[PDB]
Design an enzyme around this catalytic site. Structure first.
Site, mmCIF file in Angstrom:
data_model
loop_
_atom_site.group_PDB
_atom_site.id
_atom_site.type_symbol
_atom_site.label_atom_id
_atom_site.label_comp_id
_atom_site.label_asym_id
_atom_site.label_seq_id
_atom_site.Cartn_x
_atom_site.Cartn_y
_atom_site.Cartn_z
ATOM 1 C CG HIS A 122 31.350 39.258 37.576
ATOM 2 N ND1 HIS A 122 31.798 40.861 35.955
ATOM 3 C CD2 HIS A 122 31.471 39.748 38.262
ATOM 4 C CE1 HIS A 122 32.300 41.725 37.254
ATOM 5 N NE2 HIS A 122 32.069 40.764 38.349
ATOM 6 C CD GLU B 117 32.115 40.492 32.512
ATOM 7 O OE1 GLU B 117 32.320 38.951 31.711
ATOM 8 O OE2 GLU B 117 31.816 39.596 33.310
ATOM 9 N N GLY C 72 32.656 44.393 45.150
ATOM 10 C CA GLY C 72 31.362 44.453 45.677
ATOM 11 C C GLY C 72 31.051 46.297 44.683
ATOM 12 C CB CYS D 25 30.960 44.513 39.895
ATOM 13 S SG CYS D 25 32.638 44.764 39.109
HETATM 14 C C1 LIG Z 1 33.008 43.680 40.590
HETATM 15 O O1 LIG Z 1 32.535 42.051 40.381
HETATM 16 C C2 LIG Z 1 35.083 43.495 40.803
HETATM 17 C C3 LIG Z 1 35.424 44.805 40.318
HETATM 18 C C4 LIG Z 1 36.884 44.394 41.092
HETATM 19 C C5 LIG Z 1 37.528 43.417 41.554
HETATM 20 C C6 LIG Z 1 38.061 44.393 42.571
HETATM 21 N N1 LIG Z 1 38.745 45.621 41.909
HETATM 22 C C7 LIG Z 1 37.876 46.336 41.156
HETATM 23 O O2 LIG Z 1 36.739 47.204 40.333
HETATM 24 N N2 LIG Z 1 35.280 42.549 39.390
HETATM 25 C C8 LIG Z 1 36.033 41.369 39.185
HETATM 26 O O3 LIG Z 1 36.276 40.726 40.298
HETATM 27 C C9 LIG Z 1 36.324 40.909 38.374
HETATM 28 C C10 LIG Z 1 34.945 39.756 37.962
HETATM 29 C C11 LIG Z 1 35.328 38.986 36.600
HETATM 30 C C12 LIG Z 1 35.155 39.847 35.556
HETATM 31 C C13 LIG Z 1 35.243 39.618 34.392
HETATM 32 C C14 LIG Z 1 34.671 37.883 34.307
HETATM 33 C C15 LIG Z 1 35.222 36.854 35.485
HETATM 34 C C16 LIG Z 1 35.799 37.505 36.280
HETATM 35 N N3 LIG Z 1 37.391 40.578 37.980
HETATM 36 C C17 LIG Z 1 38.811 41.069 37.804
HETATM 37 O O4 LIG Z 1 38.283 42.419 38.386
HETATM 38 O O5 LIG Z 1 40.222 40.893 37.484
HETATM 39 C C18 LIG Z 1 41.188 41.300 38.435
HETATM 40 C C19 LIG Z 1 41.483 42.505 37.417
HETATM 41 C C20 LIG Z 1 40.794 43.650 36.093
HETATM 42 C C21 LIG Z 1 41.801 44.072 35.269
HETATM 43 C C22 LIG Z 1 43.357 43.141 34.392
HETATM 44 C C23 LIG Z 1 43.674 42.062 35.610
HETATM 45 C C24 LIG Z 1 42.828 42.185 36.770
#
Ligand SMILES: *[C@@H](O)[C@H](C[C@@H]1CCNC1=O)NC(=O)[C@H](Cc1ccccc1)NC(=O)OCc1ccccc1
Length: 181
Positions: free
Chosen positions: A41, A72, A146, A148
């Site tokens: 992403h 991913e 932040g 990832c």
């Molecule tokens: C790093 O980009 C970020 C880290 C997350 C945000 C809040 N805590 C974290 O560890 N990742 C995301 O925001 C991901 C982004 C993503 C990944 C794959 C495809 C599209 C977008 N999204 C995410 O964490 O969604 C929340 C979530 C995760 C797992 C289960 C339910 C909800």
């Protein structure tokens, strides 16, 4: 200095880089030669900001499993003179769990950051932000935006890349050595 600290710090020095794409700040893992990995992403483009300069990306491969499901991870080949210290031996042949792992983060905002995430367990299927994803693992720690690309490490092994979190728990894409063969 002890061994776990020495390994983690050495990863930071030699393999774990601060990067920026159009999607924001990420931690990048350089694995060997000119080959690195990022969370999909992050959407790396033709160039990427790495540490203090703009680096051209020669090839990007978004990994999927045998059923076409998102893993991913994006493998990027960089146009650089550096060959990363080869850490493939530290990556297990199969996605492996761990006890008392440390998440290693390196971003402009979160430089040289060590986060004790605790045990890491098999999770498999995850639907993240509407993207079904496979071969994930899970830790009971409230990871944040932040973080990832952060590198999941335990006892001299490099086992995953941080990809998401639900406010209570965090998830990584599991690493296996073959991805980098
Ligand atoms: C790093 O980009 C970020 C880290 C997350 C945000 C809040 N805590 C974290 O560890 N990742 C995301 O925001 C991901 C982004 C993503 C990944 C794959 C495809 C599209 C977008 N999204 C995410 O964490 O969604 C929340 C979530 C995760 C797992 C289960 C339910 C909800």
């Amino acid at each position: 200095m002890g061994p776990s600290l020495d390994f983690a710090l050495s990863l930071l020095r030699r393999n774990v880089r601060q990067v920026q794409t159009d999607q924001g700040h990420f931690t990048m893992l350089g694995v060997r030669d000119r080959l690195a990995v990022l969370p999909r992403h992050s959407q790396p483009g033709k160039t990427i900001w790495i540490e203090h300069k703009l680096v051209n990306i020669l090839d990007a491969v978004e990994l999927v499993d045998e059923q076409g499901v998102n893993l991913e991870l994006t493998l990027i080949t960089l146009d650089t003179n550096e060959k990363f210290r080869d850490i493939t031996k530290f990556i297990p042949e199969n996605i492996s769990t761990a006890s008392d792992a440390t998440l290693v983060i390196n971003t402009e905002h979160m430089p040289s950051m060590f986060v004790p995430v605790g045990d890491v367990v098999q999770y498999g299927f995850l639907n993240l932000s509407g993207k079904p994803t496979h071969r994930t693992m899970m830790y009971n720690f409230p990871t944040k935006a932040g973080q990832c690309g952060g590198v999941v490490t335990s006892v001299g092994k490099v086992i995953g890349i941080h990809i998401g979190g639900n406010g209570r728990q965090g998830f990584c894409a599991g690493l296996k050595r073959s991805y980098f063969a």
